[PDB]
Write a structure and sequence with these properties.
The structure is cut from a larger assembly and holds one copy of chain A (502 residues), two copies of chain B and one copy of chain C (501 residues).
Chain A lengths: L1 H15 L8 E5 L7 E3 L2 H7 L9 H12 L4 H13 L12 H21 L8 H14 L10 H13 L10 E6 L9 E2 L15 E5 L1 E3 L21 H4 L1 H18 L5 E3 L6 H10 L2 E3 L5 H10 L18 E9 L2 E9 L5 E6 L3 H23 L3 E3 L3 H13 L8 H11 L1 H9 L4 H13 L5 E4 L4 E4 H4 L2 E3 H19 L11
Parallel strand pairs in A: 3-11, 6-7, 7-8
Antiparallel strand pairs in A: 1-2, 4-11, 5-9, 9-10, 12-15, 13-14
Helix pairs in contact in A: 1-4, 3-4, 3-18, 4-18, 5-13, 5-14, 5-18, 6-7, 7-12, 13-14, 13-16, 15-16
Chain B lengths: L1 H19 L9 E4 L5 E4 L2 H7 L9 H12 L4 H20 L4 H22 L9 H10 L9 H16 L14 E4 L12 E2 L14 E4 L1 E4 L9 H14 L4 E5 L9 H10 L2 E6 L2 H9 L19 E6 L8 E4 L13 E4 L2 H23 L9 H13 L7 H11 L2 H9 L4 H10 L17 H18 L2 E6 L2
Parallel strand pairs in B: 3-11, 6-7, 7-8
Antiparallel strand pairs in B: 1-2, 4-10, 5-9, 9-10
Chain C lengths: L1 H19 L10 E4 L5 E4 L2 H6 L9 H13 L4 H20 L4 H21 L2 E2 L8 H12 L9 H14 L13 E7 L37 E3 L17 H11 L3 E3 L6 H9 L4 E2 L31 E2 L4 E2 L10 E2 L9 E7 L2 H23 L2 E3 L4 H13 L7 H12 L1 H9 L4 H15 L23 E2 H19 L11
Parallel strand pairs in C: 4-11, 5-6, 6-7
Antiparallel strand pairs in C: 1-2, 3-12, 5-8, 9-10, 12-13
Helix pairs in contact in C: 1-4, 3-15, 4-12, 4-15, 5-11, 5-12, 5-15, 6-7, 6-10, 7-10, 11-12, 11-14, 13-14
Classes of the chains: A alpha/beta (502), B alpha/beta (480), C alpha/beta (501).
PDB class: chaperone
Keywords: Chaperonin TRiC/CCT, Allosteric network, ATPase cycle, Conformational landscape, Cryo-EM, chaperone
Entry title: TRiC at 0.05 mM ADP-AlFx, Conformation 4, 0.05-C4
Chain lengths: 502, 480, 501, 429
């Protein structure tokens, strides 16, 4: 435990004093001593120095993951992870708390830390009239070499409304893409009705009002799909069908749990036999088939459902709903257009091509076009820096530290101390007193004045909005996510296995 | 982290105090005995620090500071080391008071910028249009060299060479375009400017070589005349492609691999009167590509007419043991008219020290190009800064207020060393300078002792960033 | 000697066993291991960790020999048997000091192990005899527990069904014969896990050579399956064995039969592949040794050695052959499935990093071993520590009714079973002694049931609501190997270590 | 390391208990101890071993104070109480490795000791002091460990009749220090005089003028002294004088303490007897007189009859008797093992280890007797299941009083508690 905690601090001490523009520098010296150099880069110092500590090699792969996202903030990841391991010494002797319970306390603290930074985050998106107009011009530049360059106005307009109308996560998991044949690309339009290829039902109506959607995964029709190898021992042919008829009687136990929920719409990945489906007709239950994987997850996001396939207790679950389910037919194929989804946020771009070659090139080019538009949400958006954002996160941790059990009480409280260590180290390299600035900053933000921060030039507390010192919000989440994953493995280590040299 | 910095400051202070004894011509010379058995003796600070083979990592930074000191200002390589050690010596008590090095580092950069404006107000504003102060500056600077009576003749030659290439807004001028070619024979009184270009070697001494040609083209060619590695047929196509572009001057890069020009090719070039100059050093390859505006040509197919220069007259001047070839009228609008001065003398020890003497003479004149004006040396600019910082230190507040008092005290080390190396009492002479300071200011003018302002300015600027970078390293680890 | 080796065998076993006690369970530690072949992966599987341990103690070497044979039967019970067998050695050390011979300890644990099997069967429950529709959910949630500690836990919903169909295809309902040689695990760098699909056939790692060759195979006007040619004789003019220093005849015989693909181990030439391009006959170069000896049984075809006897119905028939591009990888492999049930299923998993592929590869392979034991016995028991507590209370109560010297051998077996729930209680952040006494009180005064240590955070007992079950044949195989290992260690009273030269 | 300092004292304490363990029972192994003064003594009595051992270990000296209280209260079991103390220390070694604080370990011994007494009284047969046939055979079996055998038949009613007079009812603690064993040279074992009033240690005046006998003596007829002319002065006044009174008997006579005062000498004794004190505050103190020829007679007899009074003392304070030989310790370990499931938490596991710690006493008795260690212990749990207190020691006349088995567990709970409660020790002066 000493090499994984104290031994990891010495690795973080090299990047500790090098954080910030006023930070110190380190020396990398070889045997000949004439090849040396002086630089503040944290990734260069760690990779150049050979590490005989087998526990220090874990932090090497952590810096490589951070460098993939963005080339800034690699130093702050090791420094923040070193403060969590430094306080881990007190988490053993005078605490005696299970390490995984301490990690679970960080997940509850990181959830409130990201929500606290979102409300205090600012952006340059103000005067959106100029901002929203430039979004369509950027998408037209990405249309070069792509078949979508034929019409810039109509094709880029669908990509513009596919971003701002989301009001949430910009990941492609909220956007549905459908590839169909027998049409032209100019007829494509934006529709939120969640259009998919397959239909459902035969004699059932195509319109459903006040629908209740529930997501589950089970096989209700002819389980054990492979019959090869079985041996049927029966006294008569009619006695062999008794096992199949006995299974139909047991189907009422699974149907009764569904009927008690009062849902007219069911989701199934596999098929359904006529008898359990005929019982759904009297109850007015329609089952949707061929939901794949994204169709299962994306349906729970727009309707507010759950992805669990089992029922742990009756009359307790997460249920969705939609106002109207409309089924139309276009291109000689039936389509499913949902309407009136509660709090539904998503978009579905239906690409209608004339062949298979135009569908694959349009989908791959749309992902690259939407990636630039979605990047503008995480880019140029900053937060108040200079100790501000570091202290604001400490207030959200203290809120969770109020109501807590006995095991995670010291774990959540220890995370709040590491958050104040970031402005403490930055104030050390600035040449001023860190204990005086961090202490006065907590008492000010405690009651009101959440925009205050630490001024490095004047060595006092000043308004960050007037000084104009801000730090990117994407950098804040990247460091917390990297520190949460790096500390999750290290705290669970009860023994060290030396890696084999290559 | 103090144990790492204090160990580097004490190690650097002993090196700075050792070089401090070498300040001035009367200073104490340091001896260095190499492992091979070679022993050098001189007062140059850059030579001592280069051959000392210092194993201390931070102490090796003084070599880079002394390199930039001679490259920019050209003087004060010893004084910049003394000022660097003076700030490190005063920083020993700063760490005992609990002062973080960031305030120490930020105060040196802020004091270095304010110290320049103080010197400019006390400096006498001069212009480059007046040749009276330009000749007297280079003439008095040569009093430290063997040349005495001949120093007055070389003074206007160095002035007219810089003023042509200085222009106005050019500011820094590359010193690599000025090539001093030393050769045995001749004398100092015989000099030729030859603004076109000057090579480092002679011409072909064999039979058949014209050695002189008028209206010829000069270009860089990396090819070489050699047999196949029948012979006259292979050499015929080589000279035939050169005749297509009418290139009468062939410059072959010196290489020990093969020869330069075959004896059979000399008879072919004698009819066309094509002059060839061999033994071109590798350092002159980049030099000839600038002033002449040509390009190095590796193969025979790369040889073109557009890459060839122009020469009005190429001849071999008759001189004892010299035979220097000159080129005039390069006629290149894109390339600037640089100056290459030929140094001649009977003894080998003459043309050697004469070349080094002209280096410091051109730097002092070049200091006036970047910033005009000059300040007399002898401790005058170092003490004058401390006079203004006495009352200014009271106007500050906080930790930085104490740094201004210690910064003026460290500047007194330079004038104190000048009094010690001259045998006079250290403190007694310094008190006599501050006593008359109430009336006189710059008064050294009657002794014809002049120093450029860039030397005093760069000495403070380089020493400010040096000491700043020393305190930045708090740890030393092994990395391989 | 007797007073020396007998005491040293107990201390040598506790040193190795205490290392894996921290990694036991889903909350344990994932150890970094590097194989000498260059493969780097991170997993908590004890069979890999124990195999990489190199030491000169002859007592700890028996763990690797037992884990090698257990890897074929289960492979996931490596950490369970070593800890359970070490608990029997701790109780055996006290019996030696009381004057009991070590040979009686070996025979004492055998009568206690067989007696506890009949007690667990009485409290065991059956799947098909209770609820048939829950049989699908039992196989889906069984792999979710082992995959909860890995990044696979995000997509686990889709990956849970991939392990169900792979085990059923290689087995028979009545016979229940599953062989690891019939299930292969492969993966490549690039892409993500969401693009992984279940393949009913081999990989072959084929780009179809020249791109002009068709990437998909047509049924050719409603033919029977897809004609494929398995042949050891390529297309090229022959020579004799006495020298060492015809085109239209061989190639036309293959076209008459209709074989689309030809398999040859070594590489081909340029012009040699030009004749097969005009006829739309893709070529196969660099054949690995993995492509023959079993699966063709499911083709229901014939085997023709030479070009002379080739025909339409004597060629192997498959469902279809197509080349699907995977991400940006230039390999462009193929997927061959089959409509009818085959005897071999190869799983295909993709990942963005080489370490991610190997992490999910062994994590999915362990899920196949858990399902293998669930389909072997329809009757399952409640796990999570409830099996060791229930079996211990039956032996401890029946120990007083059995008199003689074996009376104390039965009490030590009941206390040794309590090591497993106390070890999982420490890894879950609970009092191992307080939880052990709590589980015994709830199963006595209230009612007889199975309540184990909590793997996930909760506030009370009765994990039965979560429907967490473990296979009966899997838990029974662990107690038999742990008892046999404890008997095998006692049979060696002397450690002979030869020197070096 | 505060706990490691205590663990060093536990290991040193278990080494002392293992040394005394070999001396348990009449067949136990003797221990040779060489004193610094040069005296060489050997015996199987655990009280004499720990007294002359001169233990310098601070915690190990607690066994001496418990052995002193074991002989002062019960009078028997000074060897077995050391083994039972070391059994709880050995079981507590594994408890410290599990993170258990000794407070719970010490507090659980209080509930375990009180529960063991209630369980032992259920199987014990309650007896009364009104039956004189049981007390004769009880004290006669304790005399079978000495050379005197056939002459011990007359010594049984001597100790029984002395206690029954002072027993009364609800007497609780009965001090045996008031009963003095008089050792004089001459006589035999069969010759004994009770003299219930009191018995002195000294003779009378052999000079001239001494009356040596007085009727209705206390106007001081008889006096005691802790000159030859003073004897002649009081001779005319008819005042009996007894001088040379031992300083040790001064405190003895101040507690127990005349119608007739006379000097009766069987052979050579010349002893004065007093009868009929009839004091309201003072009770009827009886001093036993022992006569013998050789010195080894009255010596070995003194220690034999002293242990017989302790067994009777146990029956007076606590009624009932049980069969010795570790018979009840087997059933107690069986009942506490099944009742351990009724508890919850860390304390429930202590009941399981406490049952195994009680089996060391019957195991040691089987080891020191030459019988197989583990084989005899297995036969105890087998036979005690069907029968109750039937294993046969009743036919062999082996009877151990219940107060000895009760005090052995009670004193062991306090002895082990005082050990684990010491977390450190330092020089104090």
């Amino acid at each position: 435990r000493l090499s994984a905690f104290v031994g990891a601090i010495a690795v973080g001490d090299l990047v500790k004093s090098t954080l910030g523009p006023k930070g110190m520098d380190k020396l990398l010296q070889s045997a000949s001593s004439n090849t040396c150099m002086v630089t503040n880069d944290g990734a260069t110092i760690l990779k150049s120095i050979p590490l005989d500590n087998p526990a220090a090699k874990v932090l090497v792969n952590i810096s490589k993951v951070q460098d993939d996202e963005v080339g800034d903030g690699t130093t702050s990841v090791t420094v923040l992870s070193a403060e969590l391991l430094r306080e881990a010494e007190k988490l053993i002797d005078q605490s005696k708390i299970h390490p995984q319970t301490i990690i679970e306390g960080y997940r509850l603290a990181s959830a409130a830390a990201l929500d606290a930074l979102t409300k205090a985050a600012v952006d340059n998106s103000h005067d959106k009239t100029m901002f929203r107009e430039d979004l369509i011009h950027i998408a037209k530049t990405t249309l070069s070499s792509k078949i979508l360059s034929q019409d810039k106005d109509h094709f880029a307009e669908l990509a513009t409304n596919a971003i701002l109308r989301l009001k949430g996560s910009t990941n492609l998991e909220h956007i549905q893409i459908i590839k169909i044949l027998g049409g032209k690309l100019s007829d494509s339009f934006l529709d939120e009705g969640f259009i998919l290829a397959k239909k459902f039902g035969n004699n059932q109506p195509k319109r459903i009002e006040n629908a209740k959607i529930l997501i589950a995964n089970t096989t209700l029709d002819t389980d054990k799909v492979k019959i090869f190898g079985t041996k049927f021992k029966v006294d008569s042919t009619a006695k062999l069908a008794q096992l199949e008829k006995a299974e139909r009687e047991k189907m009422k136990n699974k149907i009764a749990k569904i009927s008690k929920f009062g849902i007219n719409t069911f989701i199934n990945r596999q098929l359904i036999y006529d008898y359990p489906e005929q019982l759904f007709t009297d109850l007015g239950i329609n089952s949707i088939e061929h939901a794949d994987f994204e169709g299962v997850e994306r349906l729970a996001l727009v309707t507010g459902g759950e992805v669990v396939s089992t029922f742990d207790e009756p009359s307790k679950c997460k249920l969705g709903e939609c106002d109207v389910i409309e089924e139309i037919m276009l291109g000689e194929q039936p389509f499913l257009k949902f309407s009136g989804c509660k709090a539904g946020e998503a978009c579905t771009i239906v690409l209608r091509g004339a062949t298979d070659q135009t569908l694959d090139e349009a989908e791959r080019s749309l992902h690259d076009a939407l990636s630039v538009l979605s990047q503008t949400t995480k880019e140029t958006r900053t937060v108040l820096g200079g100790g501000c954002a570091e202290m604001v996160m400490s207030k959200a941790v203290d809120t969770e530290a109020q109501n807590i059990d006995g095991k995670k009480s010291l774990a959540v409280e220890a995370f709040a101390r590491a958050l104040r260590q970031l402005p403490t180290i930055l104030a050390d390299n600035a040449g001023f007193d860190s204990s005086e600035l961090v202490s006065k900053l907590r008492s000010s933000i405690y009651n009101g004045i959440s925009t205050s921060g630490l001024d490095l030039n004047n060595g006092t507390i000043a308004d960050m909005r007037q000084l104009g010192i801000v730090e990117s919000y994407k950098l804040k989440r990247a460091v917390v996510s990297s520190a949460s994953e790096a500390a999750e493995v290290l705290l669970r280590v009860d023994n060290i296995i030396r890696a084999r040299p290559r | 982290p103090q144990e790492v910095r204090k160990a580097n400051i004490i190690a650097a202070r002993s090196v700075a105090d050792a070089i401090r004894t070498s300040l001035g011509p009367k200073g104490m010379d340091k001896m260095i005995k190499t492992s091979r058995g070679e022993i050098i003796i001189s007062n140059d600070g850059h030579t001592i620090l280069k051959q000392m083979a210092i194993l201390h990592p931070v102490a090796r930074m003084l070599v880079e500071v002394s390199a930039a000191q001679d490259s920019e200002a050209g003087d004060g390589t010893t004084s910049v080391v003394i000022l660097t050690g003076a700030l490190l010596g005063a920083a020993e008590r700063l760490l005992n008071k609990g002062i973080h090095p960031t305030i120490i580092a930020d105060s040196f950069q802020s004091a270095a910028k304010r110290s320049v404006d103080i010197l400019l107000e006390m400096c006498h504003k001069v212009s480059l249009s007046d040749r009276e102060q330009l000749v007297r500056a280079a003439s008095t600077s040569l009093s430290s060299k063997i040349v005495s009576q001949y120093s007055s003749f070389l003074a206007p030659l160095a002035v007219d060479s810089v003023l042509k290439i200085s222009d106005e807004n050019s500011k820094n001028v590359d010193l690599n375009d000025i090539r001093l070619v030393k050769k045995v024979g001749g004398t100092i009184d015989d000099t030729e400017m030859i603004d076109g270009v000057v090579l480092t070697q002679t011409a072909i001494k064999s039979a058949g070589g014209p050695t002189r040609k008028e209206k010829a083209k000069i270009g860089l060619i990396q090819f070489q005349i050699s047999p196949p590695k029948e012979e006259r047929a292979y050499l015929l196509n080589i000279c035939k492609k050169i005749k297509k572009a009418k290139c009468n001057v062939l410059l072959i890069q010196k290489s020990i691999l093969r020869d330069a020009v075959n004896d059979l090719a000399l008879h072919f070039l004698s009819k066309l009167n094509i002059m060839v100059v061999k033994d071109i050093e590798r350092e002159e390859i980049e030099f000839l590509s600038k002033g002449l505006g040509c390009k190095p040509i590796a193969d025979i197919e790369l040889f073109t007419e557009d890459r060839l220069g122009s020469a009005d007259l190429v001849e071999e001047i008759d001189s004892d043991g010299s035979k220097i070839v000159r080129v005039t009228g390069i006629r290149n609008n894109n390339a600037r008219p640089t100056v290459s001065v030929v140094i001649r003398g009977a003894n080998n020890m003459i043309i050697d020290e004469t070349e080094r003497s002209l280096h410091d003479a051109l730097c002092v004149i070049r200091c006036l190009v970047k910033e005009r004006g000059l300040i007399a040396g002898g401790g005058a600019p170092e003490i004058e800064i401390s006079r203004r910082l006495s009352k200014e230190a009271r106007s500050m507040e906080g930790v930085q207020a104490f740094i201004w008092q210690e910064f003026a005290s460290a500047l007194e080390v330079i004038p104190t060393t000048l009094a010690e190396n001259a045998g006079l009492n250290s403190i007694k002479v310094v008190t006599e300078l501050r006593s008359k300071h109430e009336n006189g200011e710059l008064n050294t003018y009657e002794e014809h002792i002049l120093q450029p302002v860039l030397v005093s300015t760069s000495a403070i600027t380089l020493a400010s960033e040096c000491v700043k970078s020393i305190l930045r390293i708090d740890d030393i680890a092994f990395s391989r | 000697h007797g007073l020396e080796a007998k005491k040293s065998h107990i201390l040598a076993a506790r040193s190795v066993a205490s290392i894996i006690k921290t990694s036991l369970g889903p909350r344990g530690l994932d150890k970094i291991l590097i194989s000498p072949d260059g493969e780097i992966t991170i997993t908590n599987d004890g069979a890999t960790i124990l195999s990489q341990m190199e030491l000169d103690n002859e007592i700890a070497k028996l763990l690797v020999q037992l884990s090698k044979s257990q890897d074929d039967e289960i492979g996931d019970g490596t950490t369970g048997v070593v800890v359970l067998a070490s608990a029997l050695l701790d109780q055996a050390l006290e019996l030696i000091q009381k004057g009991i011979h070590p040979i009686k300890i070996a025979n004492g644990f055998d009568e206690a192990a067989k007696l506890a099997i009949s007690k667990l069967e009485e409290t065991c429950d059956d799947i098909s005899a209770s609820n048939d529709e829950l049989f699908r959910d039992f196989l889906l949630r069984a792999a979710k527990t082992s995959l909860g500690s890995k990044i696979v836990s995000k997509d686990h919903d889709r990956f849970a069904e991939m392990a169900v169909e792979a085990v059923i295809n290689v087995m028979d309902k009545d016979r229940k014969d599953v062989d690891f040689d019939l299930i292969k695990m492969q993966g490549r760098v690039g892409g993500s896990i969401s693009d992984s699909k279940l393949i009913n056939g081999v990989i072959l790692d084929k780009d179809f050579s020249h791109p002009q060759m068709p990437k998909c195979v047509l049924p050719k006007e409603g033919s029977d399956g897809v004609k494929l040619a398995i042949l050891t004789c390529p297309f090229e003019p022959p020579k004799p064995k006495t020298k060492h220093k015809k085109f239209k005849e061989m190639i036309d015989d293959v076209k008459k039969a209709g074989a689309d693909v030809v398999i040859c181990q070594w590489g081909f030439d340029d012009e040699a592949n030009h004749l097969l391009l005009q006829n739309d006959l893709p070529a196969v170069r660099w054949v690995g040794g993995q492509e023959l000896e079993h699966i063709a049984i499911s083709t229901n075809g014939r085997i023709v050695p030479r070009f002379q006897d080739l025909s339409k119905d004597k060629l192997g028939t498959c469902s279809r052959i197509y080349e699907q591009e995977f991400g940006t990888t230039k390999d462009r492999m193929l997927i061959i499935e089959q409509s009818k049930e085959t005897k071999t299923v190869t799983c295909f998993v993709r990942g963005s990093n080489k370490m991610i592929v190997d992490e999910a590869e062994r994590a999915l392979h362990d899920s196949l071993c858990v399902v293998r034991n669930l389909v072997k016995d329809s009757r399952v028991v409640y796990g999570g520590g409830a099996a060791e507590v229930t079996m211990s209370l039956a032996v401890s109560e029946e120990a007083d009714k059995q008199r003689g010297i074996d009376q104390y051998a039965f009490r030590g077996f009941a206390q040794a079973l309590d090591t497993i729930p106390m070890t999982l209680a420490e890894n879950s952040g609970l009092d191992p002694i307080g939880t052990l006494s709590t589980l015994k009180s709830k199963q006595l005064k209230e009612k007889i049931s199975n309540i184990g240590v909590d793997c996930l955070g909760y506030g009370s007992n009765d994990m039965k609501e979560l429907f967490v079950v473990d296979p009966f044949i899997g838990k029974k195989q662990q107690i038999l190997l742990a008892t046999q290992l404890c008997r095998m260690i006692l049979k060696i009273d002397n450690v002979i270590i030869s020197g070096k030269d």
